[PDB]
Amino acid sequence: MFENITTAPADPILGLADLLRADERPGKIDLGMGVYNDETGKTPVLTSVKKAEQYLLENETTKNYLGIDGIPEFGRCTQELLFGKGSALINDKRARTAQTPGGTGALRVAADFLAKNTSVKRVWVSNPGWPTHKSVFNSAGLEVREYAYYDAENHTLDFDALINSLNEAQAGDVVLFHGCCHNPTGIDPTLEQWQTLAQLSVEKGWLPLFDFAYQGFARGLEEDAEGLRAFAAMHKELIVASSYSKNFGLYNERVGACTLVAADSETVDRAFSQMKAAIRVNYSSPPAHGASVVATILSNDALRAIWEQELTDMRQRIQRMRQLFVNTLQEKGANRDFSFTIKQNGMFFFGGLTKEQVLRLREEFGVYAVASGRLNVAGMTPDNLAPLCEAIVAVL
């Protein structure tokens, strides 16, 4: 049965882990996957998380199955975090949230739900964008079309090209937006642009799908959700795939959510029943630990305060590394200006390297990055910064 199976192509992002494994050189620098590192180059468990796990260890009395949609408190807290404490969507009961195994899992559930219960045939994703998006939607049998987004020469959001590109999108099509911290450009729409996009979306009849994996990494928790809330204020229907992998440092516990929004309570409930059916034939019910940690923290004033501060510190360290990176490049002799990286929100640096330069950095300097030229700024520390820049200056 398996004699003719062909080897699968390596994943451009997740595949870096395997290459790093094989490389036995001592000075390897991992700037591939979007994972936060502290000044010591480690990816620690948040303190607020440790305290939540301590609490669970002492008060948890059973591991009995959660409902198909997960922990109810988790859903409410996720909705508040997304739409705002007193949002009308929450009051009118127009939203239903299902706990999922990570943001990627949320995207899969959304894709299966769409393919089987709606007339959606196309999903529009940005270019440049996150490769996993095409893979997930394609695996569900939906076609992916790309829309322009980045002005590679000026390092800004090419709004005109974006609008012009989406005009080929027909009503009933799904258009995917990154809530904040666009992966990989790091350039997000301004509030006014978000408002124009929401407006346009309503007229064209698109079904907006927001991938929200970095809430809190651009400017703040509430600020990062203004784009989404702008859309939520005008749309009757929408979908949100969010993740707690990064803002909680719960990467391997797979904590995400898929939120469905309909015109009214009656409609979202009927639709959500089908979303639950898509989960039922996938993994049945979600893993409790990670989501439990998130629910516990967001529900406890004390823990939540500690957590928000830790998030703030993470965002701030990355912002400081961007300056140090740019500065160190200038005093190391870089024959090019990489100051535009200061405007980029999120964990990454993008737009200054070719795939060959990335390949040379790996083979000759042991510096690992995505072939697209995306480097994880969150992986830079005061210790690896010097050798990292020396390697870069050597390939420019």
Please, which of residues 286-315 interact with its own copies by CB under 8 A? Answer: 286-290
> Is 374 a known ligand-binding residue?
yes
Smallest Cα–Cα separation from 105: which of 218, 253, 226?
Answer: 253
Query: How far, in Å, CA of 233 to CA of 231, rounded?
Result: 5
Which residue is closest to ligand PLP by CB? Answer: 103
Helix (H, G, I), strand (E, B) or coil at 7: coil
Binding partner selected for residue 130 from its own copies, ligand PLP, none, CB under the kind-specific 5 to 8 Å limit:
ligand PLP
Q: Give the one residue of 71, 81, 176, 213 binding ligand PLP; rule: CB under 6 A.
A: 213
Structure letter (DSSP) for residue 252 = G
Site string (86-125) toward ligand PLP, x via CB under 6 A:
----------------xxx---------------------
For the CB of residue 181, give the shortest distance to its own copies in the complex, in Å.
18
Residue 43 touching its own copies (CB under 8 A): yes
Site string (123-142) toward its own copies, x via CB under 8 A:
---------x--xx-xx---
Residues 247 to 266 in contact with ligand PLP, rule: CB under 6 A: 256
130 assigned to active site: yes
Query: Who's near 331: CB < 8 A, 6+ residues apart?
Result: none
Nearer to its own copies, 208 or 227 (CB): 208
* Catalytic-role residue among 112, 173, 211, 224: 211
Residue 233 has a CB neighbour count (10 Å cut-off) of 13
Nearer to ligand PLP, 213 or 367 (CB): 213
Q: Is the alpha carbon torsion for 31, 33, 38, 40 positive or negative? A: negative
Residues 327 to 346 in contact with ligand PLP, rule: CB under 6 A: none
85 assigned to active site: no
Count of alpha carbons within 13 angstroms of residue 214, beta-carbon side: 24
Residue 265 touching its own copies (CB under 8 A): no
Binding partner selected for residue 243 from ligand PLP, its own copies, none, CB under the kind-specific 5 to 8 Å limit:
ligand PLP
307 assigned to active site: no
- Do 198 and 166 form a contact (C-beta atoms < 8 A)? no
Query: How far, in Å, CA of 224 to CA of 227, rounded?
Result: 7
* Catalytic-role residue among 130, 194, 206, 307: 130
> Is 96 a known ligand-binding residue?
no
Nearer to ligand PLP, 99 or 183 (CB): 183
Residue 170, class by beta-carbon neighbours within 10 Å (0-12 exposed, 13-18 middle, 19+ buried)? exposed
- Do 363 and 335 form a contact (C-beta atoms < 8 A)? no
Query: How far, in Å, CA of 19 to CA of 298, rounded?
Result: 37
Which residues are designated catalytic? Answer: 130, 211, 246
Binding residues for L-aspartate: 34, 130, 183, 374
